């Protein structure tokens, strides 16, 4: 019974729950890796050992947070629970293949942990650039186990994306056009089209790195006529779309949360929100070499990547303002979920705005490979993707479990986290402008004050993480069972009750074509 249910699943809700659990466990590993980082940097000198060990920690930190935390929660977790409910579908199109998406992640995680246990770890950066990631400067199994980890995570997400796109286009009620699906479902679809197009290119480029390391090819080795910078283009041609992948389901959830705790039946400017997500999607595939502005590219190439990168502010600004216009006139409910979404709106906008500073190739010469970048991307990831995750979690926890959280504790958790992440990352802008490089285990003495504070903020985030776990315990311990939820008329995923039965929409909804 157990093994049939949880190892052999063909049910979108139980597979969605497994992804949530997996992603929460990855969050704790990611959080530990991040405290090791800030502990090394929390005073001048050397805490752990030289740059090799420090950057094995740094690399795993990124891979765990992006691949094992954010994507599985947002897409495997929320996406599988919610998308079939929100379109009145009985399950995903390929419910059995959906379960292999899930079961590829624990082995992909094992290969990542193996890579760090053997030899001296892969201390390469999560971008795995050669030649440092090559078989001379990283001899032995760690980079290969890393590559293989990524292959499996890749296959997992490409089969997920085919499942989501198919299910969203093919399994809506016959009367429902694509422009009558909720924005979260739109964000999963766009997201999946991006996974589909971008992961095969990373798979090609990490395959060439594997053959360069193990079969005597020279795609990236100038001695055989190859080029290390080709690898960067391949990687980035995936890596920019990847960060739009990490954010877009967060934008979808935000729009549902803001709408719901403003007392609104619908988000402001629906079609503009759609158009914005599709534009950001598309634009996200033509801008990748803004990660290469110091490699030595011609000037016109740099002019074009600066401008194509900037233009993304326009559709992204449409979203920000439509979220404000959704709040406008609302009957505002100050839930813990709403607080995470309001923080999202403001702190994403700040990190999106320092993205725009970085889009300027002239100034990026001096910001590139410094903590300015690090401050940028943690605003959008630690206070953007993560805030959406948390707002989605506290919002839909009662739906998934049938139990309520304590709102007061969840408010306290938000407040602690808000202070902890800002204290962590805000001073890193100063570190970046004043010239502190990335991927350093130690720093010239002048950079001490900000690194000390940043490390202290990281501890405040730790306490927020440990508190979250006690909060989830408390909910399950106390068993306050949900009774009534408002606004079901425009929130279909709640209408089968909490938690919904294993099988829902065995009889589809009735929707007239008129």
């Amino acid at each position: 019974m157990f093994i049939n249910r949880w190892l052999f699943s063909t049910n979108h809700k139980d597979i969605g729950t497994l992804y949530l659990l997996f992603g929460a466990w990855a969050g704790m590993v990611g959080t530990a890796l991040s405290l090791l980082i800030r502990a090394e940097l929390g005073q001048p000198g050397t805490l752990l050992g030289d740059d090799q060990i420090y950057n094995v920690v740094v690399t795993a930190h990124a891979f765990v947070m992006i691949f094992f935390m954010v994507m599985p929660i947002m897409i495997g977790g929320f996406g599988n629970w919610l998308v079939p409910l929100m379109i009145g579908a009985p399950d995903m199109a390929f419910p059995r293949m959906n379960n292999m998406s899930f079961w590829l992640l624990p082995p992909s995680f094992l290969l990542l942990l193996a890579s760090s246990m053997v030899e001296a770890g892969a201390g390469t950066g999560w971008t795995v650039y050669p030649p440092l990631a090559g078989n001379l400067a990283h001899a032995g199994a760690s980079v290969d186990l890393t590559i293989f980890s990524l292959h499996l995570a890749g296959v997992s997400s490409i089969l997920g994306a085919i499942n989501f796109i198919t299910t969203i286009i093919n399994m809506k009620p016959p009367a429902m056009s694509q422009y009558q699906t909720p924005l979260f479902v739109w964000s999963v679809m766009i997201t999946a089209v991006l996974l589909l197009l971008s992961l095969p290119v990373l798979a090609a480029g990490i395959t060439m790195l594997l053959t360069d390391r193990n079969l005597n090819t020279t795609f990236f080795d100038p001695a055989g006529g190859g080029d290390p910078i080709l690898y960067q283009h391949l990687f980035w041609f995936f890596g920019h779309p990847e960060v739009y992948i990490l954010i877009l389901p967060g934008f979808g959830m935000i729009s549902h949360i803001v709408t719901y705790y403003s007392g609104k039946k619908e988000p402001f400017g629906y079609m503009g929100m759609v158009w914005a997500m599709m534009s950001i999607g598309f634009l996200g595939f033509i801008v990748w070499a803004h990660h290469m502005f110091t490699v030595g590219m011609d000037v016109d190439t740099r002019a074009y990547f600066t401008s194509a990168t900037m233009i993304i502010a326009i559709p992204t600004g449409v979203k920000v303002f439509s979220w404000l216009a959704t709040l406008h006139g609302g009957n505002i409910k100050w839930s813990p979920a709403m607080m995470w979404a309001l923080g999202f709106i403001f702190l994403f906008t700040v990190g999106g705005l320092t993205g725009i500073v970085l889009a300027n190739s002239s100034l990026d010469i001096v910001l590139h490979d410094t903590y300015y970048v690090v401050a940028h991307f943690h605003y959008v990831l630690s206070m953007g993707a993560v805030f959406a995750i948390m707002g989605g979690f506290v919002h839909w926890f009662p739906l998934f479990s049938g139990y309520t959280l304590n709102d007061t504790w969840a408010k306290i958790h938000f407040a602690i986290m808000f202070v902890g992440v800002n204290m962590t990352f805000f001073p890193q802008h100063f570190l970046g402008l004043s010239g502190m490089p990335r991927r350093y285990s130690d720093y010239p003495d002048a950079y001490t004050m900000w690194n000390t504070i940043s490390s202290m903020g990281s501890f405040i985030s730790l306490t927020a993480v440990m508190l979250m776990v006690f909060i989830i315990w408390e909910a399950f311990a106390s068993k306050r069972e949900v009774l009534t939820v408002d606004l079901t008329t425009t929130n279909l995923e709640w209408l089968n009750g909490c938690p919904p039965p294993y099988h829902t929409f065995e009889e589809p909804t009735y929707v007239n074509l008129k």
């Binding site: 752990l48 776990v469 311990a477 106390s478 068993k479 306050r480 069972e481 009774l483 009534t484």
Partner: protein, 43 residues
């Protein structure tokens, strides 16, 4: 949202135990490694 009163109420004292055991499950193993770091570094 409305809900029923807790089926198995968790009192202040029970919350203090839950919270304490939760903080310690993260603090102790990591504190143990960090405190012995010098012993590792010369070994």
């Amino acid at each position: 949202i409305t809900a029923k009163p807790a089926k198995t109420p968790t009192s202040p004292k029970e919350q203090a135990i839950g919270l304490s055991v939760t903080f310690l499950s993260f603090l102790l193993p990591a504190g143990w490694v960090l405190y012995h770091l010098d012993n590792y570094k010369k070994s």
